[PDB]
Write an enzyme that holds these catalytic residues in place. Structure first.
Site, PDB file in Angstrom:
ATOM      1  N   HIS A 139       0.804  -1.218   0.000  1.00  0.00           N
ATOM      2  CA  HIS A 139       0.000   0.000   0.000  1.00  0.00           C
ATOM      3  C   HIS A 139       0.840   1.272   0.000  1.00  0.00           C
ATOM      4  O   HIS A 139       0.293   2.360  -0.241  1.00  0.00           O
ATOM      5  CB  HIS A 139      -1.000   0.002   1.170  1.00  0.00           C
ATOM      6  CG  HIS A 139      -0.418   0.427   2.485  1.00  0.00           C
ATOM      7  ND1 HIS A 139      -0.045  -0.475   3.454  1.00  0.00           N
ATOM      8  CD2 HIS A 139      -0.180   1.656   3.005  1.00  0.00           C
ATOM      9  CE1 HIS A 139       0.432   0.178   4.503  1.00  0.00           C
ATOM     10  NE2 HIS A 139       0.334   1.474   4.265  1.00  0.00           N
ATOM     11  N   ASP A 198      -0.068  -7.609   1.994  1.00  0.00           N
ATOM     12  CA  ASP A 198       0.403  -6.220   1.870  1.00  0.00           C
ATOM     13  C   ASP A 198       1.932  -6.226   1.835  1.00  0.00           C
ATOM     14  O   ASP A 198       2.613  -5.955   2.822  1.00  0.00           O
ATOM     15  CB  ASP A 198      -0.139  -5.387   3.022  1.00  0.00           C
ATOM     16  CG  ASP A 198       0.095  -3.897   2.846  1.00  0.00           C
ATOM     17  OD1 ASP A 198       0.498  -3.476   1.744  1.00  0.00           O
ATOM     18  OD2 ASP A 198      -0.192  -3.149   3.802  1.00  0.00           O
ATOM     19  N   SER A 257       3.968   3.004   7.800  1.00  0.00           N
ATOM     20  CA  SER A 257       3.642   2.020   6.773  1.00  0.00           C
ATOM     21  C   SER A 257       4.882   1.513   6.073  1.00  0.00           C
ATOM     22  O   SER A 257       5.725   2.298   5.638  1.00  0.00           O
ATOM     23  CB  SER A 257       2.744   2.672   5.726  1.00  0.00           C
ATOM     24  OG  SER A 257       1.455   2.888   6.236  1.00  0.00           O
TER      25      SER A 257
HETATM   26  N1  LIG Z   1      -7.210   8.657   5.946  1.00  0.00           N
HETATM   27  C1  LIG Z   1      -5.908   8.410   6.420  1.00  0.00           C
HETATM   28  N2  LIG Z   1      -4.819   8.987   5.979  1.00  0.00           N
HETATM   29  N3  LIG Z   1      -5.821   7.429   7.481  1.00  0.00           N
HETATM   30  C2  LIG Z   1      -7.080   6.948   8.042  1.00  0.00           C
HETATM   31  C3  LIG Z   1      -7.432   5.531   7.597  1.00  0.00           C
HETATM   32  C4  LIG Z   1      -6.472   4.499   8.189  1.00  0.00           C
HETATM   33  C5  LIG Z   1      -6.642   3.026   7.764  1.00  0.00           C
HETATM   34  N4  LIG Z   1      -7.316   2.286   8.819  1.00  0.00           N
HETATM   35  S1  LIG Z   1      -8.916   2.032   8.810  1.00  0.00           S
HETATM   36  O1  LIG Z   1      -9.371   2.203  10.158  1.00  0.00           O
HETATM   37  O2  LIG Z   1      -9.476   2.849   7.771  1.00  0.00           O
HETATM   38  C6  LIG Z   1      -9.138   0.304   8.415  1.00  0.00           C
HETATM   39  C7  LIG Z   1      -8.621  -0.058   7.052  1.00  0.00           C
HETATM   40  C8  LIG Z   1      -7.484  -0.846   6.910  1.00  0.00           C
HETATM   41  C9  LIG Z   1      -7.008  -1.183   5.655  1.00  0.00           C
HETATM   42  C10 LIG Z   1      -7.662  -0.741   4.524  1.00  0.00           C
HETATM   43  C11 LIG Z   1      -8.789   0.044   4.648  1.00  0.00           C
HETATM   44  C12 LIG Z   1      -9.267   0.384   5.904  1.00  0.00           C
HETATM   45  C13 LIG Z   1      -5.256   2.373   7.626  1.00  0.00           C
HETATM   46  O3  LIG Z   1      -4.655   1.922   8.594  1.00  0.00           O
HETATM   47  N5  LIG Z   1      -4.752   2.273   6.390  1.00  0.00           N
HETATM   48  C14 LIG Z   1      -5.450   2.596   5.131  1.00  0.00           C
HETATM   49  C15 LIG Z   1      -4.434   2.239   4.069  1.00  0.00           C
HETATM   50  C16 LIG Z   1      -3.079   2.486   4.756  1.00  0.00           C
HETATM   51  C17 LIG Z   1      -3.323   2.001   6.191  1.00  0.00           C
HETATM   52  C18 LIG Z   1      -2.475   2.777   7.194  1.00  0.00           C
HETATM   53  O4  LIG Z   1      -2.712   3.954   7.471  1.00  0.00           O
HETATM   54  N6  LIG Z   1      -1.470   2.092   7.739  1.00  0.00           N
HETATM   55  C19 LIG Z   1      -0.583   2.665   8.741  1.00  0.00           C
HETATM   56  C20 LIG Z   1      -0.792   2.071  10.114  1.00  0.00           C
HETATM   57  C21 LIG Z   1      -0.221   0.842  10.442  1.00  0.00           C
HETATM   58  C22 LIG Z   1      -0.358   0.336  11.713  1.00  0.00           C
HETATM   59 CL1  LIG Z   1       0.344  -1.218  12.083  1.00  0.00          CL
HETATM   60  C23 LIG Z   1      -1.041   1.019  12.688  1.00  0.00           C
HETATM   61  C24 LIG Z   1      -1.631   2.229  12.368  1.00  0.00           C
HETATM   62  C25 LIG Z   1      -1.530   2.766  11.088  1.00  0.00           C
HETATM   63  C26 LIG Z   1      -2.262   4.088  10.773  1.00  0.00           C
HETATM   64  N7  LIG Z   1      -3.741   3.916  10.802  1.00  0.00           N
END
Ligand SMILES: N=C(N)NCCC[C@H](NS(=O)(=O)Cc1ccccc1)C(=O)N1CCC[C@H]1C(=O)NCc1cc(Cl)ccc1CN
Ligand SMILES: CC(=O)N[C@@H]1[C@@H](O)[C@H](O)[C@@H](CO)O[C@H]1O
Ligand code: NA
Ligand code: NA
EC number: 3.4.21.5
Lengths: 250, 28, 11
Positions: free
Chosen positions: A43, A99, A198
């Site tokens: 991603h 991923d 990420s």
């Molecule tokens: N709008 C933003 N810039 N961030 C808000 C959405 C965050 C999303 N988490 S979620 O609650 O939407 C669940 C989700 C999930 C994977 C794919 C789609 C949705 C998420 O997490 N994603 C979406 C794709 C990228 C990915 C990410 O931001 N990874 C970094 C990350 C990794 C870890 Cl281990 C812990 C926290 C985080 C930050 N949340």
């Protein structure tokens, strides 16, 4: 990284920063697995919901870094990308299943006190160490809180969580290609990855041979460091056959 | 790499970092 | 907020 600390110099010499050329900005973490190959999250390179689809020439990798924003002259090395490889069954539509992505560098990087590859797990090391309660270490230059940004690389140690607890923390479908880590609300202690972390590594130090192994890739979380949520990590060993196929083929 | 996972400033010097013991203690 | 990197890497 939320609720972590500043890394020691040379603490994570496999750390890689994925860097956008224009505008010059941090895109993700990553890790060095040989002199020519860097491992990251798919991603970080391809995420259509956010209009993200990078090509090789969009990106640089910066290796050997400690400071987030400084140009660390005579220490860091900056490398161009020959080719991106994304897992063909990476599921960006639903839950980031599989991923994982590899990046081949245009030229090999010279190892140094600050630049050195991490090991990838064999089946036995993975079986021994991927157990609930066992702690790994996550590193990155991402945000310090969900809702700011660090001067230097941050590090946090976090326990692997039982799979039923991971599943019961979310409405998202969890697959065998993921594991989760973090403290529970009743455990007192805190910490998580966050935006910008990420693609960086979740590592464990084998007590059998003294070596650091990359068991996970920072993948996703509902928020950062929320009570009752956990961070989700790509299960590197489960996808190692693909890794080996790519490296053997290219 | 034959030398993977052995950090120049730590394992290759038989120096420990400040929190790796926390990991070892969890490997019960 | 990032320090400029050498132009050689952007060419
Ligand atoms: N709008 C933003 N810039 N961030 C808000 C959405 C965050 C999303 N988490 S979620 O609650 O939407 C669940 C989700 C999930 C994977 C794919 C789609 C949705 C998420 O997490 N994603 C979406 C794709 C990228 C990915 C990410 O931001 N990874 C970094 C990350 C990794 C870890 Cl281990 C812990 C926290 C985080 C930050 N949340
Ligand atoms: C899932 C997706 O949209 N993938 C696209 C691919 O189809 C396209 O060929 C490429 C061009 O750079 O960009 C990416
Ligand atoms: Na659930
Ligand atoms: Na949490």
């Amino acid at each position: 990284i939320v609720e972590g600390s500043d890394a020691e110099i040379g603490m994570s010499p496999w750390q890689v920063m994925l860097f956008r050329k224009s505008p010059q900005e941090l895109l993700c973490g990553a890790s060095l697995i040989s002199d020519r190959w860097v491992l990251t999250a798919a991603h970080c390179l391809l995420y259509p919901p956010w209009d993200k689809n990078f090509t090789e020439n969009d990106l640089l990798v910066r290796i050997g870094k400690h400071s987030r924003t400084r140009y660390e002259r005579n220490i860091e090395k900056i490398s161009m990308l020959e080719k991106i490889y994304i897992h063909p069954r990476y599921n960006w539509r639903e839950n980031l299943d599989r991923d994982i992505a590899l990046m081949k560098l245009k030229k090999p990087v010279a190892f140094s006190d600050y630049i050195h590859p991490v090991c990838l797990p064999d089946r036995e090391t993975a079986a021994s160490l991927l157990q609930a309660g066992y702690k790994g270490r996550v590193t990155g230059w991402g945000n310090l809180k969900e809702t700011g940004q660090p001067s230097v690389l941050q590090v946090v140690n976090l326990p692997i969580v039982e799979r039923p607890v991971c599943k019961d923390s979310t409405r998202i479908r969890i697959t065998d290609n993921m594991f989760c880590a973090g403290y529970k609300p009743d455990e007192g202690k805190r910490g998580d990855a966050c935006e910008g972390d990420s693609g960086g590594p979740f590592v464990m130090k084998s007590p059998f041979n003294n070596r650091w192994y990359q068991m996970g890739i920072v993948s996703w979380g509902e928020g950062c460091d929320r009570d009752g949520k956990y961070g989700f990590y790509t299960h590197v060993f489960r996808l190692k056959k693909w890794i080996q196929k790519v490296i053997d083929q290219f | 790499e034959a030398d993977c996972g052995l950090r120049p400033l730590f394992e290759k010097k038989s120096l420990e970092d400040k929190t790796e013991r926390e990991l070892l203690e969890s490997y019960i | 907020d990032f320090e400029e990197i050498p132009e050689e890497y952007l060419q």
